[PDB]
């Protein structure tokens, strides 16, 4: 069975050259030829075929939309292949997958009716424009009037940080039930923002200490923020 592993820079600046390298570890030594291809999936969108190349011939085939920006090369001696994208824009942020396609034959002409069509684990590529920075953490306090209900909701807004990821815990990890940390969304400022909320018994307000612990390795920023009601 053939195995594919892809690698490359996780962050590429705009208008630069995005280089991805996918290596193959197989062949069964029978002098087969595979078809090595690249496919991307943008966040919230479907799959799209960038291009591909044969494993023995120089015949390489490209998407007409991306024909002028994509260059696909291969090294058969070292069993790997490289994709280069030029004039990268913000729309190119996507999960890239490298693939090998083959057809099983008994002999040259005796098709057996089988393929492999394998896909690599893939890597996320983000087209950023800002630099590293730690988050600002703002408590999302329950309104004083919302004590009439039996369940209270509180949270923490983690805003203006770059790059991903940020890990959010509650009460140093002791509070896990009811915790929802939403995915990060890139803001018009060019930096990430998210919220981490939790639902708790409203009777526990005033007896429980609720602290959100935010961790951001890239700026080495750890912030512990209390969240309490607003007494008037």
């Amino acid at each position: 069975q053939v195995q594919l592993q892809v690698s490359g820079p996780g962050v590429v600046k705009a208008s630069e050259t995005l280089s991805l390298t996918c290596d193959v570890s197989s062949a069964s030594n029978t002098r087969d030829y595979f078809y090595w291809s690249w496919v991307r999936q943008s966040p919230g969108k479907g799959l799209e075929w960038i291009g591909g190349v044969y494993s023995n011939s120089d015949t390489s085939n490209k998407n007409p939309s991306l024909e002028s920006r994509v260059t696909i090369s291969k090294d058969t001696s070292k069993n790997r292949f490289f994709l280069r994208l030029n004039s990268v824009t913000a729309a190119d942020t996507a999960v890239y997958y490298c693939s090998s396609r083959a057809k099983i034959y008994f002999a040259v002409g005796y098709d057996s009716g089988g393929r492999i069509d394998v896909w690599g684990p893939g890597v996320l590529v983000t087209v950023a424009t800002a630099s590293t920075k730690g988050p600002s953490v703002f408590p999302l306090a329950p309104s004083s009037r919302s004590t009439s209900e039996s369940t209270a909701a509180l949270g923490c807004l983690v805003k203006d940080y770059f790059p991903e990821p940020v890990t959010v815990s509650w009460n140093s990890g002791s509070l896990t039930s009811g915790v929802h940390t939403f995915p990060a969304v890139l803001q018009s400022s060019g930096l990430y923002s998210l919220s981490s909320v939790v639902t708790v018994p409203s009777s526990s307000l005033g007896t429980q200490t609720y602290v959100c612990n935010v961790n951001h390795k890239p700026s080495n920023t750890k912030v512990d923020k209390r969240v309490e009601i607003k007494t008037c």
């Binding site: 703002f138 306090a141 309104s143 919302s146 807004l157 923002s193 919220s195």
Partner: peptide, 18 residues
Amino acid sequence: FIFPPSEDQVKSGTVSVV
């Protein structure tokens, strides 16, 4: 639920209502 921004968020020049 709705979370009004804190005053500290207001002084930052930008606010987020969740």
